[PDB]
Amino acid sequence: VLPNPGLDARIPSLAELETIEQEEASSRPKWDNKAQYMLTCLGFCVGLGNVWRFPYLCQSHGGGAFMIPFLILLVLEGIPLLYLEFAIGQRLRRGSLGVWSSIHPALKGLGLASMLTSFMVGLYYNTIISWIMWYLFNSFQEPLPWSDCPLNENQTGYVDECARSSPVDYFWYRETLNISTSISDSGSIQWWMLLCLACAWSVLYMCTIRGIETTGKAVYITSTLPYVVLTIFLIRGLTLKGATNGIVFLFTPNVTELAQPDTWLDAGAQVFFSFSLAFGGLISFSSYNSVHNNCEKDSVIVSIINGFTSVYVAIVVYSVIGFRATQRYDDCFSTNILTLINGFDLPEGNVTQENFVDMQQRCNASDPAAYAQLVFQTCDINAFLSEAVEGTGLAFIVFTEAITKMPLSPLWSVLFFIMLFCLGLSSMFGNMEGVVVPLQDLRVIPPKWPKEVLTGLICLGTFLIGFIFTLNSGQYWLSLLDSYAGSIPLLIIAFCEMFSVVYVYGVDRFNKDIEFMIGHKPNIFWQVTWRVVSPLLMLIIFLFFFVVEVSQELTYSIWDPGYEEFPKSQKISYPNWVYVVVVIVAGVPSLTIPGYAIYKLIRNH
């Protein structure tokens, strides 16, 4: 009903907008061609959405049809709210804290909330990009370390840890991570990891030191390289033995997985993370555009590009998974043939894949008590594809071992890690601007010490706070933080977004703005979504999440070298010592929202 008095005294009026047109240039670096602006936006969106998130356990837990709801959920939450965003910054010529400071200053809570969310996201994406570039460093050599076990001091055999497990598994978990046996124990400083993280921070600083002007120069290649590499990796993927089995595995769904509604929750959280709304970055890009700049069509163009790139990534990754499964199945069948051949002294080349069962039963029927001691393996296809990684291994302990079975292994590994580097750089650009803009807009520092040193001090702050993940057990810490990235606070600021837009800001004003700078009166579905139907879903899914989470199943996997059937999974639940951290990391913003409102109510009303 718009109960706010003096609603116009703070928003830039139409006459003021006309006057400020084409006269202000200081502190507001004008963009180049708007196509480059969409390029940066789409690159940041795909970079944040894809790496470490889509092919993560989100993709490999549903294992197939998981993605079908997601796309639908797109049109139920992506297009509307992204249309609600991408234009507030355009109208107000300011974002971050400006939007929620200039309108209804009583709450002003989404500002610091988005600040904290972006800082949390960056704090761990820096570790992720550090690991990616460390794996890049160890390339550029024919004998890739993740290809053969290191012989121990005996000079004739491998270590038991490397022998029982895989070579690549040992290289990731021991040579690089040096992971601990629990969370309670702390290891060394892992100097090489810290040095790599320092190099990552340095290159991120170099690629953006002055703001958008430096960012755009790098974007022209950062947002285009991965796209060119994905196609060549795909076309290499099809021309592989046993491929196109993963594709038909992905296409075929199971109904029972659709029946369980946790996949709905995961798809909603994933689309919200991927499109990167309620982050402050998009409003910050949009705050430096002309008033008459088109916004409705470029938004759907970006959305379609993101939706197609997701399908492309899924197709490539499942083609590789299918190739790996076929190779493993072939090796197992060859071993099964060889054991019978050795046991029964048959000619080599008589028992093939097509005539294995009949000969296997004929040898058994010839003479019992000699076939009995033979131990056969029951490996079968459609079960090797189902084996998925619990986390972080889909690009480190799976894709590398598939690379090692291809002709140009080092160069192809280099290209793969370069594409991951580029995507991580795009995401870091977006997050870094999204956190650094509100600090400058807050005017917490005087004109002196300009942005060149402000970015330096904030980047150093991030560098010296990110030492925790460099510890031996730090990986475990990351496991407990990523699961709280798209946590409750992000959803609550999301729920705040549109009801503040539709119940505080005049929707008629927004419509008049659309007819002013865009025209093409928005369709009925747009307003009905902006008012009702669309705002409720997230509330329902949040209530469903709250109902589900009462059945706590928190548990972090452990390497556990001192453990029988060592190449397996370890369940240890969680120590209560970190439980208080959930209190620290979650629920803080709710303390600050009502304070100013109650203070004003008791001071004036």
């Binding site: 550029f140 004998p143 040095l195 190099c199 340095s202 170099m206 030191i209 002055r210 060149e452």
Partner: protein, 47 residues
């Protein structure tokens, strides 16, 4: 050609002498420091 009781033992390889990744990181760090210094010089020079 296996003799079923005699196993090969003299096959130890060692190709990389000293940590080529160290030299790769060194050249990357050099290139990135050059970028830092040129960017800061251009920034402080542009009035």
């Amino acid at each position: 050609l296996e003799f079923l009781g005699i196993q090969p033992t003299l096959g130890p390889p060692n190709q990389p002498p000293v940590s080529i990744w160290l030299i790769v990181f060194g050249v990357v760090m050099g290139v990135i420091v050059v970028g830092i210094v040129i960017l800061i010089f251009t920034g402080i020079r542009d009035r």
